[PDB]
Amino acid sequence: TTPDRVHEVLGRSMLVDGLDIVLDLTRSGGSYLVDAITGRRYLDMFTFVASSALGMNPPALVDDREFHAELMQAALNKPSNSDVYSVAMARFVETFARVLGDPALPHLFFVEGGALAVENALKAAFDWKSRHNQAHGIDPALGTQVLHLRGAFHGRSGYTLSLTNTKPTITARFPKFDWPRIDAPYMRPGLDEPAMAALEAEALRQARAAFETRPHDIACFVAEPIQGEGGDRHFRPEFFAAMRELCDEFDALLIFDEVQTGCGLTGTAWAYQQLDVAPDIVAFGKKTQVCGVMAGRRVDEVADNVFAVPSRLNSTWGGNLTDMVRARRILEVIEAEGLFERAVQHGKYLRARLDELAADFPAVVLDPRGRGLMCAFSLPTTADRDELIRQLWQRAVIVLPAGADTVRFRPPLTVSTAEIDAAIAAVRSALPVVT
Amino acid sequence: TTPDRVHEVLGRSMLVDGLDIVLDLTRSGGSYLVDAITGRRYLDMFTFVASSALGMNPPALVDDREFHAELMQAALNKPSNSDVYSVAMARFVETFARVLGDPALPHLFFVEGGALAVENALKAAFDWKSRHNQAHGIDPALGTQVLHLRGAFHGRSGYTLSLTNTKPTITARFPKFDWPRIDAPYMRPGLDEPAMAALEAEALRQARAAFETRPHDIACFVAEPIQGEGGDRHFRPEFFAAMRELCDEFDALLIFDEVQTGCGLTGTAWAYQQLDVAPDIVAFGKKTQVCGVMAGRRVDEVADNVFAVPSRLNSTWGGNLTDMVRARRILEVIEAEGLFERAVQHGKYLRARLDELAADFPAVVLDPRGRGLMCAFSLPTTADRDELIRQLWQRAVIVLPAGADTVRFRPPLTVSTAEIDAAIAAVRSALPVVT
Ligand SMILES: *Cc1c(COP(=O)(O)O)cnc(C)c1O
Ligand SMILES: *Cc1c(COP(=O)(O)O)cnc(C)c1O
Ligand SMILES: O=C(O)CCC(=O)C(=O)O
Ligand SMILES: O=C(O)CCC(=O)C(=O)O
């Protein structure tokens, strides 16, 4: 089976709705994808839905003969790391703790899949709330609901389908728990301090009302620090600092879903580090390759929590050993080359260019915004947005849509300023055509 | 970090409750695990919780220089196969269809994780039932419940936690849907044809009552063809053939969870092929490395089902490309070496030895049973079971417990009769010590 026959072969068994290219695994590299059919190079601001930190075939991985051997050893088999430990696994865990760890959150748990990472964070919270309730003379049957935001995306699994609320296509006709959902008070253009404060106060009012009308039954509040799939919606730190206090007042855990924001994209290991709010639990995935949770803060107040008691959390493999070995090497590159700081600097550059676009096309390029390399802007209508994406595709630049009218940039941490310039030049070329 | 320090390093971040050994990834091979600390060899009847078809480092994979290159190419990166297709992916899909495919079930969907495979089978059914209901003038809000068995294990995720019911530790304090659950009429020793028929009739009665008291609201019946984690409980084909008819009478899909039974263990590609019952959907995982669903039969009667409509099912990666490339090569070995048939023959051998043990130790070795290499026996009490497992561990044989009193054998498809003899010799040695 040959590149030109890939779509045909797959189409016999599956819905074939992805990109028109066929990925060349060997010739792709850095910020460029290679189409195996034409040899055409594509500028990648998409990074496999933001899951690639360094882009394709990074030199530090490709030229490292010792790493090749370690990776091969892992890749040939697939141990259940739940039950059977290895040196490869222990090296990953210690480097994860060194590069991404938070001293307040020492409990680590790994699994395959971002939705399942979020689910295990939820399970930790449900168990914590039931046991905390029990220890304080409250019915242990209480502690089963999850406070969350409108416009949230947390995955497509049994619990996260009750949380995710963006496109109806994701959730329609699937059974759900009736869990309390509040307005998301995100920053929008032309709202000053007082206007924002009033927006947040209303969300906060709705949050308090949920806690007071479902006493002892809300186990946690879950949020994305920046809502990705719902449209790159950013929140003031003040909002989360208030939610942190409300969570403590009502003995509920605060969980951040960093599956999209995490591993350096915003300029720090985690987006929450820049908001100055301490979570009790963090779910991670995508760029980390292996998915999972970090937990601590109030979790440790319940001595028999899911991190302390055998067999409360589990999966067959406990994460993919091949992903752990790759992730270990990627984390070492990040640490050695100062890639968080490179993300801060190139992030400021990308954002400056989007501000320039906004000035040049004030009616069309709306609400330029970003933290580190996680940047976006919006168009007047969804028709304009969809057309801009098509026009960029014709010009060999891959970007992702979000929400009704957003275009998002998800470059690798290793993106150069020339690559950012090429992307911006493509947008400038395409814009007169869309208008 | 050195083998002797692995447990120490991990224990700083996680609950360290697995095996005492440290896996040597290089020196392990075939039916033997090597402890990197001592160099001691362990006879493996555990196969990473039945997820390894060929055992460690199979020669056909290890000596194949071309495969090394293909595997390396896949392992270096982690594409989102949801969006971006490759030759590596298409080769896996076409070989999966050739070796494991069923002409009635042409729709394939892949994901990381066995619980998520089962969940997507459930989502397919919920959508199917709602749309089928709608097409026939029934409220589309109906079609949200799942008929299932007592003693079932389907995973630890949001939907499967409402289905799984073995150890309370798995499910306690996690919110659940109230879905109908019926008695499991499994074969037990000293029940003849008429006695079994009466047991099944009672389960069937309970099934019918569920359908009649929740009209149009049961989307599917899910079962393991042989219950694994609940205790290697086997069912007559007559039971499932009756359930197949009842499912059709009430317009509900029949789903088999073959995550544990699948990929040759019972002597055929799938256990259902030996029961002569046609499912509408099959969930797979473990030995297949990549997890997922095969669907067809009645699913196709609803033209806008989840396999025909974009974005109803999804995950970020759509399965691990490294797992697809490994699985492709493993499937080729199975096909080339006739490993399904080898499983039938060595399965008969293993079962014959368990019958012999039963004869020699009639009060102690209870209910020897099996299909292909999926074999087991039970002990009088759980204390006896736990002790036998410990005694086997001291003798360097790894087996797994199940339920209250079962010991299960999960050898690789490539196990030899001498290896089976060694395992049985260890059990014979340990038994006088347990009594
Ligand atoms: C992608 C995503 C998930 C789901 O991850 P998958 O690997 O596709 O299951 C969860 N939360 C957020 C914020 C996401 O970006
Ligand atoms: C293992 C198992 C699952 C769950 O698989 P994971 O990869 O651990 O999520 C589902 N069903 C059955 C029958 C199982 O054996
Ligand atoms: O739709 C999905 O399942 C993945 C979506 C996602 O993570 C994103 O596009 O930001
Ligand atoms: O407990 C788990 O999560 C995995 C169990 C399983 O699949 C088994 O032991 O048969």
From Swiss-Prot, chains A, B:
Give the PROSITE patterns listed for this entry: AA_TRANSFER_CLASS_3
Task: PTM N6-(pyridoxal phosphate)lysine: list the residues.
Answer: 286
Q: Does the keyword DNA-binding apply?
A: no
Which residues of the sequence carry a binding annotation for pyridoxal 5'-phosphate?
A: 114-115, 260
Q: List, separated by semicolons, the cofactors it needs.
A: pyridoxal 5'-phosphate
Keywords per UniProt: Aminotransferase, Pyridoxal phosphate, Transferase
Biological processes per GO annotation:
antibiotic biosynthetic process; gamma-aminobutyric acid catabolic process
Q: Which reaction does it catalyse?
A: L-lysine + 2-oxoglutarate = (S)-2-amino-6-oxohexanoate + L-glutamate
Inducing factors: 42-fold induced by starvation. Expression is regulated by the HTH-type transcriptional regulator LrpA.
One molecular function GO term is: L-lysine 6-transaminase activity
Q: Has keyword Magnesium?
A: no
E.C. designation(s): 2.6.1.36
Regulation of activity: Inhibited by 2-aminomethyl piperidine derivative.
| UniProt cross-references to CDD domains, sorted A to Z | OAT_like
Q: Quote the record's binding site residues for L-lysine.
A: 156
The record's comment on protein family reads: Belongs to the class-III pyridoxal-phosphate-dependent aminotransferase family.
Q: Give the note.
A: Was identified as a high-confidence drug target. Various compounds targeting the LAT enzyme have been identified as potential anti-tuberculosis agents.
Q: How does it assemble?
A: Homodimer.
What job does this protein perform? Catalyzes the transfer of the terminal amino group of L-lysine to alpha-ketoglutarate to yield L-glutamate and 2-aminoadipate 6-semialdehyde ((S)-2-amino-6-oxohexanoate), which is spontaneously converted to the dehydrated form 1-piperideine 6-carboxylate. Probably plays a role in persistence.
- Please state what the protein is called: L-lysine-epsilon aminotransferase
